[PDB]
């Protein structure tokens, strides 16, 4: 619907559609994106007009007089009046041809009248629209287009049709209209609106969402350019400072004040077109000094400046003898001109060692601009030259009177010894024996000394930076350095490093939502301490005394993301620097070396990474035949000796169905997790569409037009996906040289378990527990992808994508830099200047764009080196965790590695490492050796394999077990090494009770 | 093992609390958003990396 | 650890910067400029443990 | 034809023809299986690979 | 261990000390440069915004403030780029550790 | 430095670290600003097919017990004369199995 009811404060409800609402612009229209803009979206009153109804009113902008307002009506001034209706040819006006009657400043009446026949200029009477002044056609606007949907009129005279400013009249005081329509559905609206700052989302030049920056959380939303804030910490300001006192501190001096009055007599005439023209014969009179009225120097310690204006009229003969009428009335003003200070700011405690005003240009450092301001324009007529010397002997004061006023222990605007700012000034006990004032490394005043008693005062900012904690789109806490309320929070607590304000009731056992270091913030706003992770400990290679061996194992799955490749870009240096202009190319022929260097660097980087990636990826046909969910769910490829197993997947299939590729995928060889990661984190690489011209070009086509070519990357993603699929399918490949003979996944898992530790319980095996744990872990991971490791992986991929996008965005936006030239467009420069003058302008653009390209190349090379190191790490991970079991401790995740699977991810891959997690320990009495006695011959026996622990069972029989898993086995004589001596920690035994 | 992470308030660095400078910087708010987002994401990634290493 | 932390290398409390009891030091001035160094003593303690 | 200059899946031969570059194929990795009919590499030749590190 | 303790208050000890000293110095200089970038005028009458607004009319002062804004944004972008590069290098070092 | 230590001065147990294939030895030469390594690897050109068994279920009347290969990296198979042999999986180097190559366990697998 087109009718909405304004909320408190005059804000459009979030449920609106903005069917007849546009963004007002003086230039080009944004097609899509989010923008923080100052737009007339504060709806004071919304007048709904029904079908066949009549809306007739005369509105003055300084007069919020309103007729009907569905909703509350504000009492502020109205800036823009908007008509949101289909302004077709079936809209009738009660004033005849006139649709709008404008009363401008000075009583001038202007009309916007549409006729069915063309009206000649300065004469009186498809629809052709005109601006009429006194019944004569003053300006031709054009025929009414068939698609007008909104007309916005501003109090300053600007007209916006469908969002674009097509004409501006004089500032308007009052607007009379009388309209009626019948084809405007059910209701059409007239909105009185005021400007406000808001974040607007636009899609296809149409408004979709308007977020007003009216609250603290909305301020954060506008600062982040998004209406959905992720949980985290955001920098904010503690408070806002306004309406503070003023403090002035100056060195002691005599008090003598001089008033300098400048008299300006302006001469005005009426031109042939009725515009008031200010005469250059206007006179300036300075105070008399040394028999002269043309030069005046300040000779006291303090001074003030004032201007008095008189007006006279002429009749094109430069004889001023009349009084200026309403049209010819003007007021004399003084503008800055080329001076480093303004005339109106001289009475603002500015200090000089010498200040003289003159009417002659010689010896002058700068000049002011004397101008006459009329009701419509402002014209410069004279020049007032200034000769000044920097110092502190002479000060300009607001008025004649001690100038030293100091406000303490409160926010104030200070001017101390020439340094100005906003801050709080306090008295300190410190004794600094040198200097008058002190500044920081950034040049900000930190303290100053009173020259009467030597007391040192410190200066601090009124407002400081704070950190706001946002969880679920609301502010729950704030870390700040000042013990004052902020962001609507009242309760607070003290921390050794800061103050923490919160919604929590402070005069806590909760799960923190957002954490950094040892600090955590929960959902209810409470502050919690984050301690270091605790673990049971590492198993030690001890074989003496009571030792513990892990026994009961479950499965843990850990997710890791590693980047493998970048998104390579080719740049045409000539097209980037010169937008196809032949003259710019001729100029760039002298810089051709720089373009050659840039192109060579980019091409060599791309070639090296392609060579690196090419040698890493490979597939196997037989492995790819088994790499699918359908293959793992059937027994077609199983060796006939596995007739008991229903299929390849078995009990593990419930977890393998989300990792293996399936036919229910957008692309080939794609799995569920891969689709989730490529859709929840991330377009078209066809270039033939850019040159078609069938629609407005998108961002990629525009970048191509700028000479920026993103090289193909879909092929690399397909190669990575097939590579990971082949790696997954090779686990179950029974033999290599023949057909696709497959083994059950359970058999491969058993082989991996035997590699970890020799399994000695052939009959009583429980792989169902491990399979169920794996299935539940994979299910949780899949749910989380659509678990800190999953969060870290997601953050890493998101960061990679964002950085890749921003790198090209910055380079593209660097093309709108003028680089101290009249324009950033080469065609514009060559269409306005002669070639000798235009070449100098084009040279600056050339140098700036070459510098930007060099910066982009350097950043790209650094990124490429980092990704090369990351690719080396990924290759090591694939070789030592997926294609084999590594003997390196802790390399394939935290725990005892069993096997790893891999999937393709944006610009890289993700690994699922499966580890054994112990849940119990067995305690055994371990011995370092056996001291065997056979009468007079006593000899020692040590375990040959240093990784085995020797212990004794209840029946006094020696057993050996590995320390990774508790898999006891009977010791034999071949497991021992005979040595001469014995250790004190050995277990005594006889020849009869020896193993084997 | 780790760096010394820094948070920057872009508005306070560019404008020393001046409201008029903030009004002017409302037209560059995108650059400040990019800077803050980059710094915050870098700090969060290193904190996540360090957290999983120590025990 | 003490030898390395004293022969090669301050205060991370922000509440002292806004007190105004003396002239601000380098860290407080940087804070005033909108530059916040995040806590690192906790990380050093974690590494030591 | 044998491509002379390649990038990704695109290759250009000496005669100007455009060819597709597919991923490298291999027989596969030997698996630690000791059940059923298995294959063990027997006849070996020597391959030399060159790597540069700064 | 006694010799190492004496040296800390043996080429490996010297290399370790040099590495830690370099890390600390680089970390300090990175922030020092950014802080000192705030006294650049960037072709304006002053590097203080309060000074500019106390001497010029708002139409004249906005043009002066725009140059400072652009210069400080450029300095912040440079600082961010350097920080990200340092972070990547330290990430590789952390993997080694 | 890792490459020199683990590929030139020794043979690394890491799979695929010293080139694509089964690493035999590496040599090194000096290059501008660095070095180049020649990695020598074994490239197989054929495969031998054997019938491998995961263990031996030995029966001695009423006492039935299992035997597993002590070294997990060895494949157990049978020759034409019904004699058990062990071979590594990297190279086909069959050898006669002895009692010291087996571990005795209670149960048997299918
Ligand atoms: C690498 O991987 C290993 C696992 O392989 C991780 O180690 C585990 O880490 C967790 C978390 O610290 C440990 O779990 C904790 O155990 C404490 C001891 O439990 C007692 O009570 C149980 C009752 O069933 C007994 O079985 C046990 O023997 C103990 O007597 C618990 O107290 C902890 O409880 C947690 O939850 C409760 C309820 O909310 C809280 O009150 C507690 O404060 C606490 O938060 C917790 O269960 C686990 O024991 C470790 N396992 C092993 C084998 O070491 C490593 O942490 C991981 N490393 C890294 C860096 O990630
Ligand atoms: C790591 O190192 C290994 C070697 O250790 C590499 O693996 C070899 O890769 C090559 C290239 O893919 C493989 O060679 C190909 O074998 C195909 C199968 O051959 C059939 O026919 C021969 C006939 O003698 C039989 O012996 C064999 O058993 C098969 O029945 C061939 O068809 C391929 O022919 C190529 O050339 C012809 C002629 O131009 C073309 O028509 C083909 O399309 C094709 O291009 C080719 O010979 C080789 O088998 C692999 N060896 C092993 C042991 O796997 C890895 O590729 C390498 N990895 C990386 C990443 O570099
Ligand atoms: C690059 O190499 C890969 C891997 O060897 C090739 O994949 C193969 O693609 C073909 C064509 O799609 C597949 O054969 C066909 O599949 C369909 C399935 O519906 C079937 O209808 C046909 O009878 C036929 O078998 C083939 O299975 C597939 N191979 C593997 C191992 O997955 C790919 O085609 C190669 N690309 C090029 C351009 O040569
Ligand atoms: C994420 O992992 C958790 C790990 O606990 C999974 O929860 C577990 O889910 C299984 C299957 O539904 C539950 O088993 C069932 O237990 C009940 C109670 O004993 C029993 O009556 C049922 O017959 C069945 O055996 C198991 O209890 C449950 N565990 C817990 C602690 O809740 C969860 O399913 C995983 N999520 C996904 C999406 O896979
Ligand atoms: C740094 O390492 C050197 C390694 O030599 C240490 O010097 C050694 O110090 C020990 C303990 O004082 C000396 O032992 C003594 O030797 C004399 C001579 O035989 C004997 O009379 C004493 O009863 C005692 O056994 C040892 O000789 C000495 N070695 C040398 C080559 O001087 C030195 O102490 C270490 N520094 C620190 C601060 O720990
Ligand atoms: C707005 O225009 C309507 C016509 O569209 C005006 O109504 C007319 O008023 C005159 C003068 O009294 C009558 O003679 C006509 O009969 C009226 N027409 C209709 C259709 O009612 C109306 O007065 C105008 N409103 C203003 C100027 O406030
Ligand atoms: C256009 O606006 C002018 C200025 O407000 C109006 O002229 C005023 O008319 C009122 C009528 O009571 C007088 O009291 C004022 O003195 C007039 N001002 C001037 C400057 O002369 C004028 O009537 C308006 N024209 C319309 C509504 O058609
Ligand atoms: C202007 O006309 C348009 C159509 O040209 C109106 O929009 C349509 O409104 C009807 C009735 O609700 C919908 O069924 C159509 O889908 C709308 N068309 C669109 C959205 O393209 C619009 O309401 C009219 N505006 C006014 C103010 O009367
Ligand atoms: C500025 O001052 C000059 C000089 O007095 C004025 O020009 C004189 O005007 C009078 C009166 O009309 C003439 O009689 C003289 O002949 C003029 N002198 C010259 C040299 O032209 C001028 O009118 C003043 N301008 C004002 C008051 O706007
Ligand atoms: C600097 O110190 C002098 C001396 O204390 C201050 O002058 C005093 O002002 C108070 C308040 O008006 C009077 O009661 C004292 O009698 C003054 N003492 C004198 C004149 O010796 C002076 O105000 C201080 N300056 C500033 C800027 O705070
Ligand atoms: C290892 O622990 C066992 C128990 O698990 C200890 O054996 C017990 O020792 C206590 C204390 O002397 C006796 O009261 C019990 O009778 C013992 N139990 C058995 C079954 O012998 C044993 O002493 C511990 N061993 C070591 C080396 O500390
Ligand atoms: C490892 O898990 C097994 C299986 O749950 C545990 O053995 C059972 O433990 C429960 C709880 O005490 C007893 O009720 C059962 O009688 C046990 N079953 C058997 C067959 O012994 C075992 O205790 C766990 N291991 C350790 C070292 O705690
Ligand atoms: C194994 O037997 C030897 C030999 O009897 C024991 O060594 C004796 O230890 C006692 C103290 O426990 C000494 O007083 C004897 O002199 C030792 N005898 C010799 C010949 O050295 C040894 O303690 C026994 N070990 C264990 C673990 O019980
Ligand atoms: C392993 O392959 C061998 C052949 O190399 C298979 O043995 C043959 O099996 C076929 C099909 O039953 C028989 O017709 C032949 O007589 C067998 N040959 C011999 C020499 O026995 C054997 O079946 C395969 N083993 C497995 C487990 O699949
Ligand atoms: C490994 O190579 C050997 C040596 O060439 C092969 O043995 C010969 O194979 C050829 C070709 O079939 C026969 O003509 C010869 O009689 C074979 N010689 C011997 C001594 O057996 C052998 O076949 C190859 N191994 C495999 C598994 O193919
Ligand atoms: C007055 C200053 C107090 C400083 C307190 C610091 C607390 C929080 C800062 C967290 C910033 C770390 C970056 C991650 C930000 C995020 O999660 O979005
Ligand atoms: C030549 C006789 C002495 C000169 C007198 C000058 C008059 C006023 C002194 C102004 C300077 C005050 C400096 C403050 C010194 C301090 O307290 O540390
Ligand atoms: C415009 O309409 C009037 C009134 O009906 C008519 O006299 C005139 O001819 C029309 N003009 C055109 C160009 O149709
Ligand atoms: C406007 O036109 C009318 C009618 O001809 C005329 O009397 C009047 O003088 C005109 N006004 C102006 C300001 O030219
Ligand atoms: C300014 O100072 C006066 C006293 O001189 C005080 O009443 C007033 O509140 C102050 N204004 C502020 C702090 O804004
Ligand atoms: C200067 O002008 C002021 C008013 O701004 C007036 O009070 C004063 O007397 C004038 N001084 C002269 C004319 O010398
Ligand atoms: C500063 O002086 C005040 C007033 O005498 C005193 O109360 C305070 O304790 C002093 N502070 C210090 C740090 O000496
Ligand atoms: C906070 O809790 C106290 C008691 O601890 C209670 O008196 C007070 O009303 C609470 N404040 C709230 C709910 O705002």
Numbering used by the authors:
A (entry chain A): 265 to 389, 402 to 677, 682 to 787, 801 to 975, 982 to 1085, 1098 to 1307
B (entry chain B): 857 to 911
C (entry chain B): 967 to 975, 982 to 1021
D (entry chain C): 803 to 856
E (entry chain B): 1077 to 1085, 1098 to 1185
F (entry chain C): 1186 to 1295
Quote what the paper states about this structure.
Although the FCoV-23 genome is highly conserved among sequenced isolates, in-frame deletions of S D0 occurred in an almost cat-specific manner in >90% of studied cases, which suggested the occurrence of in-host evolution. We also determined a 2.5-Å resolution cryo-EM structure of a prefusion-stabilized FCoV-23 S protein ectodomain trimer lacking D0. This structure corresponds to the C10-DA isolate, which has a 211-amino-acid residue deletion spanning positions 53–264 of the S-long construct. We designated this construct ‘S-short’, which is representative of the in-host deletion that occurs in >90% of sequenced viruses. For this dataset, we identified a single conformational state that closely resembles the S-long structure except for the absence of D0, which indicated that no major structural changes occurred with the lack of D0. To evaluate the impact of the loss of D0 on receptor engagement, we carried out APN pull-down assays using prefusion FCoV-23 S-long and S-short ectodomain trimers immobilized on NTA cobalt-based beads. We observed markedly increased fusogenicity mediated by FCoV-23 S-short, relative to S-long, in all cell lines tested and at most time points in the presence of equivalent amounts of each of the two S isoforms. These results show that loss of D0 promotes more rapid entry into target cells that endogenously express FcAPN or CfAPN, a result in agreement with the increased syncytium formation for FCoV-23 S-short relative to S-long. The loss of domain 0 markedly enhances the fusogenicity and kinetics of entry into cells and possibly enables biotype switching and lethality.
All coronaviruses are decorated with several copies of a homotrimeric spike (S) glycoprotein that is the target of neutralizing antibodies, drives viral entry through receptor binding and membrane fusion and contributes to pathogenesis. FCoV-23 S-long comprises an amino-terminal S1 subunit, folding as five domains designated 0 and A–D, and a C-terminal S2 subunit.
